[PDB]
């Protein structure tokens, strides 16, 4: 049921 | 052609005059083979001629080939010479002038080549070693920019005349800038040390044109080679011919001088290694590679100067131009066009390997072998057909006559191709006349 919702937006963060 | 090749082709008097300068002796000795260096050091204090057989007995029998190679190289350079030893024998002895100058250079004594810069004290407008190297790079880039034809590089007209004498650019239409020839194209892809070495070789071959002493110029070049980077030297004490030659070198950036009246001058690492030509400088820390070669025949350039842009566009179709990056594609069309311009594939491959980006250096082969092989295949496909103008001899009714005529033509060295099975052959237009005359004369004798 991992298909409910997922985004790698938080992976995209300035470092 | 290395430096020793040009030295081996000069007259004995020029060699003798050059030997008067200790720096020239040091350069010649350092450029010798190891066995030659050992022999010269052995003969350094030998005031008597050495029997040739005695000298030959010193080396290994197996190394006799290299021994004779060094012997002939030394004889051609006229470091030593043969002397009529009493009893008909032929001894060997170094040049007394050259030997004495070498001793002065090594043992000491004599007079210094030039006075120290401390006479003028510290330089008011002194520069830094990185500044000097950057200035030399800027000067050479400006020279190449003029070679391109861009209006940015406004250089001396005498420089253009020198290039024309070198044949790089032919001024077919006066007033308009000359068009760079095929040899100029090949030179354009040479590495910067190779470019400088070729230019200096041409200058030396045309040294007498400006009425400049070749011996003096070579001695000054050697002195620059053995100079120290980051240190200036006294301009004074040199002939006006050498002064103008130094002006030319400054125009090339090989030596820095703030003003034409300045009595100091800073040689550059390019000038230091200029004597060595192409080899010798095994530790050349070149500029970082900014060319990325992808498997899809795409080149990406991390550059901003028009010079590298022109170099890349010589053999690839430009696609995009970003401020810090240029996207181009290598095609069969562009490579074939460049080859038609005279550039060889090896030059393109070596150039790309030279300006290879560090990322691609991680690959065990520097560049994708597919692309290199494709460039080689394009080069071959350009030259698939073989053309040769000649005359056909095909009326041979006798095999013996055909064999005799073929042997005579091979004696003349004018044969193009032979076919004994069909008794057919082709000859050069030049060699056609002699073979025809011989055939007619043998018919007459029959």
């Amino acid at each position: 049921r991992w298909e409910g919702g997922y985004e790698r937006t938080w992976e995209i963060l300035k470092e | 052609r290395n430096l020793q090749e040009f030295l081996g082709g000069l007259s004995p008097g020029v060699l003798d005059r050059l030997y008067g300068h200790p720096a020239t002796c040091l350069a010649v000795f350092r450029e010798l083979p190891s066995l030659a260096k050992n022999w010269v050091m052995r003969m350094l204090f030998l005031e008597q001629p050495l029997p040739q057989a005695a000298v030959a007995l010193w080396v290994k029998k197996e190394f006799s080939k290299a021994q004779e190679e060094s012997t002939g190289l030394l004889s051609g350079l006229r470091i030593w010479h043969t002397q009529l030893l009493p009893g008909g024998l032929q001894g060997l002895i170094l040049n007394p002038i050259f030997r004495q100058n070498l001793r002065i250079a090594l043992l000491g004594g004599g007079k210094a080549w030039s006075d120290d810069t401390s006479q003028l004290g510290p330089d008011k407008h002194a520069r830094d070693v990185p500044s000097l190297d950057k200035y030399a790079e800027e000067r050479w880039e400006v020279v190449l920019h003029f070679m391109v034809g861009s209006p940015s590089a406004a250089v001396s007209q005498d420089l253009a005349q020198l290039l024309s004498q070198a044949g790089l650019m032919k001024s077919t239409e006066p007033g308009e800038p000359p068009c760079i020839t095929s040899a100029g194209f090949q030179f354009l892809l040479l590495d910067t040390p190779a470019q400088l070495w070729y230019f200096m070789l041409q200058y030396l071959q045309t040294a007498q044109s400006r009425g400049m002493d070749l011996v003096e110029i070579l001695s000054f070049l050697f002195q620059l080679s053995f100079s120290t980077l980051g240190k200036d030297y006294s301009v004074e004490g040199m002939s006006d011919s050498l002064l103008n030659f130094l002006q030319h070198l400054r125009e090339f950036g090989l030596v820095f001088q703030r003003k034409r009246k300045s009595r100091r001058y800073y040689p550059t690492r390019l000038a230091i290694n200029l004597s060595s030509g192409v080899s010798g400088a095994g530790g050349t820390v070149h500029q970082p590679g900014f060319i990325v070669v992808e498997t899809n025949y795409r080149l990406y350039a991390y550059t901003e100067s028009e010079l590298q842009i022109a170099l890349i566009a010589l053999f690839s179709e430009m696609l995009y131009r970003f401020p810090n990056m240029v996207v181009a594609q290598v095609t069969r069309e562009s490579v074939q066009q460049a080859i038609a311009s005279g550039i060889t594939a090896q030059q393109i491959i070596h150039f790309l390997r030279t300006r290879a980006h560090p990322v691609m250096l991680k690959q065990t082969p520097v560049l994708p072998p597919t692309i290199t092989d494709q460039i080689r295949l394009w080069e071959l496909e350009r030259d698939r057909l073989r053309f040769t103008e000649g005359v056909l001899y095909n009326q041979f009714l006798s095999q013996v006559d055909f064999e005799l005529l073929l042997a005579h033509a091979r004696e003349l060295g004018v044969l193009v191709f032979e076919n004994s099975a069909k008794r057919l052959m082709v000859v050069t237009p030049a060699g056609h006349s002699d073979v025809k005359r011989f055939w007619k004369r043998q018919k007459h004798s029959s």
Binding site: - | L319, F322, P323, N324
Partner: protein, 611 residues
């Protein structure tokens, strides 16, 4: 503006900022994007570009992506707004983003998902929250004709309106012209007409990271959305479709290219789903099953594309399918869809969620733009080289082998000018010798050898002279599977010659050596797909970068060369390289056929006999 060298001078419109090495992206105002793989931010930029941009070229170091209205629509329907996209772009772009690209993105994103298409009660409604848009669209004559007419011919009246079933694709194309693309969103959880099905995922099912990523991107906020997902053959693409069907759990219809595809789909559904076999049926002409109670119906396009009268039972099953409304529809080999007969199938069938899976999406007839609204936006496309690195698929060793032409053969080839030249170069004695040497070498290496030959006659002659099994047009299915099992199980026979039917007409056992002799003549996607399907992941040589061997025989100085460079271009887009092998080492010592030219001239006799 263009430079004298021809490159586009975009420097003026690109304000470069000092964060050069840190930021990996170049955004040219043409709409193209460039990324550097060596950058430390590669993964983040990779995912961002995949989400927003459609990949074009992915060689080792520098990749090129493109921006399209469909790509922007996909990004919006994923759930990303304009501000976030702009911010992330400017954070990754080496130079400033040109205002033209900004304006293009604004214009595209401002109207995405505005118009909604609903399939309820076997009726298609168009609705939206902006009635001015709908009312203004009524002026379009195409929209007038597409709108359902009353029994008297009058037009039917967030209020929606029914649209003619036949005029869906017409509306699909028209809406793009109306700059208001429709939304293919399904009520995944709000469904009430179609109940769920006793089908789940077996514990043996494993989702590799790219598969799960693609599935979750499809399931935008938990609602299934129509689209196309591109995966290499054997990468679990069928498993991915099965997983999607299990997730939807609604009524499922699957369409395959051929009967073998239907059989494989049924086997995969059994292998990973919990659906009882009573609810699985194959709507084929050979194995007939009752459509009633069939939760997942598997068929082919031809079985639905039969314009001619079908069998009586087939008519009843088609009536049952037309009456039933499908929560999910699955289409395989999407590249064949743009054909007119197969496109009519989409109009024929009424389904909510349509998902397409394939290995390639470059139809040589450039009929792909319409497919962007025939099904939807391209959902995902895994990086082939990346999958090679992860070892999910074999790391292929590609090679192109040039074969010299015999002087008589070449003279004949030059003499002919029409399409009849195919036979001569496909029957090059040197090409035959090269193929024989390769087969001998790989058999001595104990390799799985599959040799393709599109030409019927050439395949027959090659296989017969080499005395190896051959499969072509007749392809008796029982004997076909007999030959396949002989190759799979018998170690004595490991050299199978296959005609054009090897593309999609049957199942290819996993192999390691694939030798392609003759191709269609420019089908850059067909033979690339054939290469992808033939060579699969094999254990033992995963560490090595060359565990699968592909050879493409091309005759020198023929037009075939022009085809090969034209074709493998697609594989170049995936970073695959082809090293030219003019000469094969070892052919001298080993005795091969046609050593004498006197044999070769007899072969020429045979070839010219067939014109």
């Amino acid at each position: 503006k263009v430079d004298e060298y021809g490159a586009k001078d975009y420097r003026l419109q690109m304000p470069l900022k000092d964060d050069h090495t840190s930021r990996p992206l170049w955004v040219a105002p043409d709409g193209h994007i460039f990324l550097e793989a060596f950058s430390p931010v590669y993964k983040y930029a990779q995912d961002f570009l995949v989400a927003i941009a459609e990949p074009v070229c992915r060689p080792t170091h520098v990749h090129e992506y493109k921006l399209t209205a469909y790509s922007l629509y996909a990004a919006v329907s994923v759930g990303l707004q304009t501000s976030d996209i702009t911010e992330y772009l400017r954070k990754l772009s080496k130079t400033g983003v040109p205002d033209g690209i900004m304006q293009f993105i604004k214009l595209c994103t401002v109207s995405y998902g505005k118009v909604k298409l609903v399939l309820k009660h076997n009726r298609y409604f168009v609705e939206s929250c902006h009635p001015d848009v709908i009312q203004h669209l009524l002026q379009d004559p195409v929209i007038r004709e597409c709108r359902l007419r009353n029994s008297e011919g009058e037009a039917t009246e967030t209020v929606s309106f029914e649209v003619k079933q036949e005029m869906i694709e017409e509306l699909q194309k028209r809406c793009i012209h109306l700059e208001y693309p429709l939304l293919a969103e399904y009520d995944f959880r709000n469904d009430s007409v179609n109940p769920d099905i006793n089908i789940d995922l077996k514990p043996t099912a494993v989702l590799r990271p790219y598969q799960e990523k693609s599935l979750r991107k499809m399931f935008g906020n938990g609602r299934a959305r129509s689209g196309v997902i591109v995966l290499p053959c054997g990468a679990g693409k069928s498993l991915v479709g099965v997983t999607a069907a299990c997730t939807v759990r609604k009524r499922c219809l699957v369409l395959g290219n051929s009967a073998v595809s239907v059989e494989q789909w049924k086997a995969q559904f059994k292998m990973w789903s919990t659906i009882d076999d009573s609810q699985i049926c194959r709507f084929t002409s050979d194995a007939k099953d009752k459509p009633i109670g069939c939760s997942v119906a598997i068929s082919t396009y031809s079985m639905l594309g039969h314009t001619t009268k079908r069998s009586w039972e087939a008519e009843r099953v088609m009536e049952w399918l037309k009456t039933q409304e499908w929560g999910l529809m699955i289409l395989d080999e999407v590249h064949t869809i743009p054909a007119k007969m197969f496109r009519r199938v989409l109009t024929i069938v009424q389904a909510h969620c349509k998902l397409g899976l394939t290995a390639t999406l470059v139809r040589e007839d450039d009929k792909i733009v319409d497919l962007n609204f025939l099904i939807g936006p391209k959902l995902y496309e895994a990086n082939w080289m990346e999958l090679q690195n992860n070892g999910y698929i074999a790391k292929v060793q590609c090679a192109e082998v040039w074969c010299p032409m015999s002087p008589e053969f070449y003279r004949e080839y030059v003499a002919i000018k029409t399409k009849k030249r195919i036979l001569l170069y496909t029957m090059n004695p040197n090409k035959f010798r090269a193929c024989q040497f390769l087969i001998k070498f790989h058999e001595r290496r104990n390799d799985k050898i599959i040799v393709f030959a599109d030409n019927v006659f050439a395949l027959k002659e090659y296989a017969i002279r080499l005395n190896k099994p051959y499969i072509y047009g007749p392809t008796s299915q029982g004997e076909r599977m007999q030959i396949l099992q002989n190759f799979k199980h018998n170690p004595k026979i490991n050299t199978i010659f296959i005609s054009k039917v090897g593309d999609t007409s049957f199942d290819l056992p996993e192999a390691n050596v694939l030798i392609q002799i003759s191709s269609h003549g420019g089908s850059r996607r067909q033979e690339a797909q054939r290469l992808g399907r033939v060579l699969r992941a094999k254990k033992g040589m995963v560490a090595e970068e060359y565990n699968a061997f592909f050879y493409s025989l091309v005759s020198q100085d023929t037009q075939e060369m022009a085809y090969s460079t034209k074709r493998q271009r697609f594989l170049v887009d995936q970073g695959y390289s082809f090293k030219v092998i003019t000469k094969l080492a070892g052919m001298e010592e080993e005795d091969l056929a046609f050593s004498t030219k006197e044999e070769q001239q007899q072969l020429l006799q045979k070839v010219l006999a067939a014109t």
